[PDB]
Amino acid sequence: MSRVQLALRVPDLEASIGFYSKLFGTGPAKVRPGYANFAIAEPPLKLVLIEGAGEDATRLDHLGVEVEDSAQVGHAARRLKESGLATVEENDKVWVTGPGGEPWEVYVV
Ligand SMILES: [Co+2]
Ligand code: NA
Ligand code: NA
Numbered sequence: 001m002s003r004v005q006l007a008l009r010v011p012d013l014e015a016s017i018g019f020y021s022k023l024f025g026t027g028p029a030k031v032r033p034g035y036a037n038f039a040i041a042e043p044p045l046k047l048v049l050i051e052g053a054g055e056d057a058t059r060l061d062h063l064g065v066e067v068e069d070s071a072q073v074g075h076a077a078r079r080l081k082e083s084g085l086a087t088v089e090e091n092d093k094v095w096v097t098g099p100g101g102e103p104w105e106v107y108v109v
Helices: 013-023 070-082
Strands: 002-010 030-032 035-040 045-051 059-067 088-090 093-097 103-108
Touching (some): 013 045, 045 059, 059 070, 070 093
Parallel strands (some): 002 045, 059 103
Antiparallel strands (some): 030 035, 035 045
16 A cells, blocks of 8 residues: 655665664665665664764654555655645656754655
8 A cells, every 4th residue: 555664764774784674574675885674564664774874872764655556656746736735846856844944755666
């Protein structure tokens, strides 16, 4: 259906991969320099780890909703705009930002 994407900026990518592998009982789906992600079935979650630049603590990088196909992104894009939110589309993604600055992407992988 759809799942939340949580992207964390972490000070230690390697330590974070080990921790999350244990927490969710599954290994990362993608690993490359400075980046890893996990595709978790239960709870439905795309977890993204971005290595920080000498960061002192983990912080939120961005948030999102991962959907099945482009049509769903388009539907979300139109609904969000009609609701009065300012949006930015990529062509597939739509971006909105919350009042305290937290960015959300609605996207298809
Ligand atoms: Co993302
Ligand atoms: Na979810
Ligand atoms: Na934060």
